[PDB]
Amino acid sequence: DWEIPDGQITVGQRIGSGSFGTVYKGKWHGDVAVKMLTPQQLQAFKNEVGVLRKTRHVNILLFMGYSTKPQLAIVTQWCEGSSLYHHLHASETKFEMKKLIDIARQTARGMDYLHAKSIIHRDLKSNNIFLHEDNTVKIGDFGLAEQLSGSILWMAPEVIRMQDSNPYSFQSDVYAFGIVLYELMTGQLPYSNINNRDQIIEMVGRGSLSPDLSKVRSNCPKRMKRLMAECLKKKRDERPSFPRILAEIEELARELS
Amino acid sequence: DWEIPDGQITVGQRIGSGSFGTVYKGKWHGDVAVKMLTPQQLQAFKNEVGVLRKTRHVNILLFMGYSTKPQLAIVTQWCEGSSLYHHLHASETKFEMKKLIDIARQTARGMDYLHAKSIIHRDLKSNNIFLHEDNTVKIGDFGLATVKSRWSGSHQFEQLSGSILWMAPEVIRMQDSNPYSFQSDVYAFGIVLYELMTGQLPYSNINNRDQIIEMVGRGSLSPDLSKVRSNCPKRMKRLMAECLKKKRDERPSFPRILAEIEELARELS
């Protein structure tokens, strides 16, 4: 099975921490990442292992195993480099249009696979798209934790309204992908001009606010700008599905190279 | 689970073909490789899916799924680029020592993982080490041949010509009809290390295959370790010699192989 016996993993350097969980770099048949969980977090651990063991895709963080003794741990592959957010907004790594579209294609592949497996990511954003060895996209959920300040920009109008106390779906994931596409094609975050977070939460929820699509770079293909606008629509039933998103991106990638 | 429904995979270009198995490049949530088998190869298919679904490692070919309708199909990730054999021997891709050691380190990681999962590779060679995007090692078994004796308990080197260089002395002897082990896999890895550090295949000066089969089996033949390049680390040459020993019980295990290479890599920076 995927259960890793006690004493096999060599837990190294502490990478990040929050309440509930701590991530480490470790050794287990090469480089690995280990996420340690509190004994209280047993159900959450079981649900996270259950979702991760359903995935075998190049563009999804590779699940490798879990441990139950001495503590609850989730073992994945070690990602090398930084997130797409870091590249676009923290560093100033100026990518060529070819590479931008490739990242978008690799992300659509990962998202399309998840949806086919009946998995909603629930928190798709550039901070959750790892650029492994500066080339391969690895979609994961790297968060550890008003409290959702780092996810509001990618939140669909109905998610912000918490519309049925169950506002998450394949369509809300499509919306977040439209925001990732915005980031890639403009090189910036949406609502950069707006100072208050409560203004964003209120105006997006009401329908009074949407990203400025005139901010896209001059070499942004026409098909990409249309698809981004289709992904960002207010009514979720108007948004496309990922099989259509991916085929549109793949057809665009070949038309460029 | 991992069964892929009919009509999902778009089977594209034919990459390679052999007795029993044909491989294709396809589309299924991005790029994929599809291996179609004959309906008569059902047991082999089940055994191959069974072994592949036990693996989740960066340095092992990523299994993605399978289909049984209209034909038996094994779906894996699509590898980009060429094999380590192609880089070292068919081309002249001249790697720096840093990269050579990294390839060996990534291969020892993959091999160590397999052994921990109680998987003997059975046919490790530079042709089965894919250099994905010219950087990440992906160990798989890319052979489509199936050549041997189906009924032959003791059997043939006229169909195993592409694997004899990596075959341990006891594998060639087929002694006990049970010659495959973790130790025979360690031997093949010693030959991959030879290839990396010399830049050449062992016994390049010997013309007859039957001469190689006879002399290696008898103990009368072993690779010329003076052929290693001048910047080959001392630790690497010793480890290669330890991996290539005639008595299999004298060969090291991969946890140790890995530990020696990893410390060596950091010792080079």
Ligand SMILES: Cc1ccc(NC(=O)c2cccc(C(C)(C)C#N)c2)cc1Nc1ccc2ncn(C)c(=O)c2c1
């Ligand atoms: C160690 C770990 C274990 C589990 C998870 N879990 C997930 O990412 C996840 C959890 C639930 C659901 C999903 C889905 C399937 C929705 C996706 N994608 C993913 C993340 C991690 N974090 C993790 C993994 C690899 C890493 N490599 C390099 N660096 C520098 C890191 O910071 C790092 C962090």
Ligand SMILES: Cc1ccc(NC(=O)c2cccc(C(C)(C)C#N)c2)cc1Nc1ccc2ncn(C)c(=O)c2c1
């Ligand atoms: C499509 C396929 C399905 C299954 C396997 N099977 C194995 O690799 C395998 C079969 C049995 C056992 C093992 C083990 C686990 C021992 C290893 N390693 C591996 C290979 C392939 N071949 C395959 C896979 C990806 C490819 N990408 C690029 N290129 C250009 C190819 O030629 C290609 C070929």
